[PDB]
Ligand binder design. Structure first.
Ligand SMILES: [Mg+2]
Ligand SMILES: [Mg+2]
Ligand SMILES: [Mg+2]
Ligand SMILES: [Mg+2]
Ligand SMILES: [Mg+2]
Ligand SMILES: [Mg+2]
Ligand SMILES: [Mg+2]
Ligand SMILES: [Mg+2]
Ligand SMILES: [Mg+2]
Lengths: 132, 62, 185, 57
RNA sequence: GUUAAUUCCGAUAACGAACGAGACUCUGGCAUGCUAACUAGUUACGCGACCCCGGUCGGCGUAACUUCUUAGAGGGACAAGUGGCGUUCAGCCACCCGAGAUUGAGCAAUAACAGGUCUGUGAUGCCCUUAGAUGUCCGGGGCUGCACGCGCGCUACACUGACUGGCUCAGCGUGUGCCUACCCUACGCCGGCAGGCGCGGGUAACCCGUUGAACCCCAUUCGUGAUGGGGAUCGGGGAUUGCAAUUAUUCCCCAUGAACGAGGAAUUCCCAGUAAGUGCGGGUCAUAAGCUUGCGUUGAUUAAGUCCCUGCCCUUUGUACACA
């Protein structure tokens, strides 16, 4: 089995986390890049780390990777969190109102409103799942 | 009981006590619509012809 | 002869394999026929690389057995060559075609095994292997303690197996295994 | 591995001490461990968005 | 789920870790590229010898170079590229390029055996003996004894073989000693042989040595007969080692010529340069390989799976066992 160990995988994740701009698709380029940036004592471990770097870069080019903190993907995530639309979906011209909700709003202070719409009650009381 | 040829279309798995028999789906090259499952001794790859002495027997699928 | 290949003095072509079940597993025609049945090796590395080995090389390899003869491949190349000479001087046909017909006739189509024994039809590569083993065993049994030499015995066993006259030990063991498998099914 | 001769018998002592790594090689060996991957920290660089020049000499 | 692996992916009252595995070292292969070479050579020349311009020479000497030689720094292989399977993660199979797409060993965790060693020790507790000695030295014998059974091995049962000639190829290696008295041997004569007599070389890429090893190849003799298979037993003689060979130390010659016709129940080892055949070195060695440890030649059958037997590792279950 050609299974990479944790000393390969965690070190490769640290290398890609610190030097995402330097690394690339080509194995013989980013192998020498990892040789320059990282102090690896042996060529076999260096080749394992470089191969797992190439595989994680293929995973990054395919999509997002869970156990990594890329600055560009973090900026994209922050942008998608800070995205604000134009008009709110809570502001509606017609709001569907059930009759018991209309009764409790009538017993509250806000009985009559401007933009509500009392609908007909759903006749036929069949809401539970059949057993077994 | 005539002799019929059958081509291997899908190997399923190892059967037998010592694991010496391949469970093999075979398509008959005479009637291509009919296909059966038999146990086969020997090294079996996909895409080769066995010479079945009878087509009526069938191995039990586990 | 740069285009067509000559197995010694024998032609590569005009070798008709009768059974289409044994077409890919008999490597004799147009790619695998060489000048000698000797070779370097590597055929036992992968599982189905043994099928790509030529059948005369497989007979050459299976002939050397029983302690005193392990690792005499030049010697059994000499045996197979003189046996092909005797096959031509008796039958008057292609020794390669006689050997292919001997494999087809001597290979048992079924066997029985423990799944009480139940009968199952064998793989064609296993059938080629069983035929190569049985005719070699019959030739060695005929050659042991006899004036008749190993080349004469191997030639007579291949000719009797291609004929199917039930005088060959390989044909007899093939009929015995087929009859036992016909019984216990 | 040493021996000590007590009155009742003889006791063996095994002392195994792993030496730490050093660049100089005085307190320990010079070669680092085969499992320790020493990864340096990247220097803080600022990417320029405006092309400029540094013509001198 | 995956892996040779508690190897990883992922879940998660766990987080952070540690040994082991892996990683590491040596070995094997690929680099017509770098460094190297009168203790390795290469190819060109100059001669010499022989055959009819050309061919051979490990016959001689020198001109650049390292392909063959050796050993140093590097490099190269990582599931990297492609096509599929797979939570599209961990990973798996096949294929292209390619010397390799699992070479082999060493090291090897916690805990334990009342496993072996007091006959390895001037490692040792306790007990025994200590002068008519269980200390030490010398002579002889024994450790080899033979109605019997077992184990590891060698020789074979032959014609796929034996004998007799001819051809033709290796790599591990080792080699003149503190005491230490004992090395590997070329070459020339004597003898059939074991061996003996003299000059030399070698502390070793210098000399043995281009290590002219066997199996194998070629050509006669044999003819299925316990035969020219097999060489046990035994008689007569001749040499080496040593103070001393008788219970034959070993080796050589002639002769004597047994069982054994492929082996019952039972059972061992193994899947690639592997098993097996086959020979060569080291250790024991004054004399010495049927053992062991390494190396080389020829070199396959079948398998790329399984828990059926023998066992091992996880989870669950039950226990009236815990020297289990
Ligand atoms: Mg014979
Ligand atoms: Mg004890
Ligand atoms: Mg004495
Ligand atoms: Mg003894
Ligand atoms: Mg016995
Ligand atoms: Mg004899
Ligand atoms: Mg005799
Ligand atoms: Mg011994
Ligand atoms: Mg119970």
């Amino acid at each position: 089995g050609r299974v990479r160990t944790k000393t390969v995988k965690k070190a490769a994740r640290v290398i890609i986390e610190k030097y995402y701009t330097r690394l690339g698709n080509d194995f013989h380029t980013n192998k020498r890049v990892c040789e320059e940036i990282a102090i690896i004592p042996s060529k076999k471990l260096r080749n394992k780390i470089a191969g797992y770097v190439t595989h994680l870069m293929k995973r990054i080019q395919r999509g997002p990777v869970r156990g990594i903190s890329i600055k560009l993907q973090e900026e994209e995530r922050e942008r998608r969190d800070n995205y604000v639309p134009e008009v709110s979906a809570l502001d509606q011209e017609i709001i569907e109102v059930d009759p018991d909700t209309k009764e409790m709003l009538k017993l509250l202070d806000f009985g009559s409103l401007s933009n509500l719409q009392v609908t007909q009650p759903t006749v036929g009381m069949n809401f539970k799942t059949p057993r077994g | 009981q005539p002799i019929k040829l059958a081509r291997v279309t899908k190997v399923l798995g190892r059967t037998g006590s010592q694991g010496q028999c391949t469970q093999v789906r075979v398509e008959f090259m005479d009637d291509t619509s009919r296909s059966i499952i038999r146990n086969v001794k020997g090294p079996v790859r996909e895409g080769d012809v066995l010479t079945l002495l009878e087509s009526e027997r069938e191995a039990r699928r586990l | 002869t740069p285009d067509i290949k000559l197995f010694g003095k024998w032609s590569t072509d005009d070798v008709q394999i009768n059974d289409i079940s044994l077409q890919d597993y008999i490597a004799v025609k147009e790619k695998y026929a060489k000048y000698l049945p000797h070779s370097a090796g590597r055929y036992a590395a992968k599982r189905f690389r043994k099928a790509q080995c030529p059948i005369v090389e497989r007979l050459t390899n299976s002939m050397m057995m029983h302690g005193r003869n392990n690792g005499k491949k030049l010697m059994t190349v000499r045996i197979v060559k003189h046996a092909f000479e005797i096959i031509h001087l008796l039958t008057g046909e292609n020794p390669l075609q006689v050997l292919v017909n001997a494999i087809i006739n001597s290979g048992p189509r079924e066997d029985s095994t423990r799944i009480r024994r139940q009968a199952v039809d064998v793989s064609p590569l296993r059938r080629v292997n069983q035929a190569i083993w049985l005719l070699c065993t019959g030739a060695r049994e005929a050659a042991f303690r006899n004036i008749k030499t190993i080349a004469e015995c191997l030639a007579d066993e291949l000719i009797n197996a291609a004929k199917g006259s039930s005088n060959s030990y390989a044909i007899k063991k093939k009929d015995e295994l087929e009859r036992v498998a016909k019984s216990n099914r | 591995v040493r021996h000590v001769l007590l009155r009742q018998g003889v006791l063996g002592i095994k002392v195994k001490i792993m030496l730490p790594w050093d660049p100089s090689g005085k307190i320990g060996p010079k070669k680092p461990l085969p499992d320790h991957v020493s990864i340096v920290e990247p220097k803080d660089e600022i990417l320029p968005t405006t092309p400029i020049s540094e013509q001198k000499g």
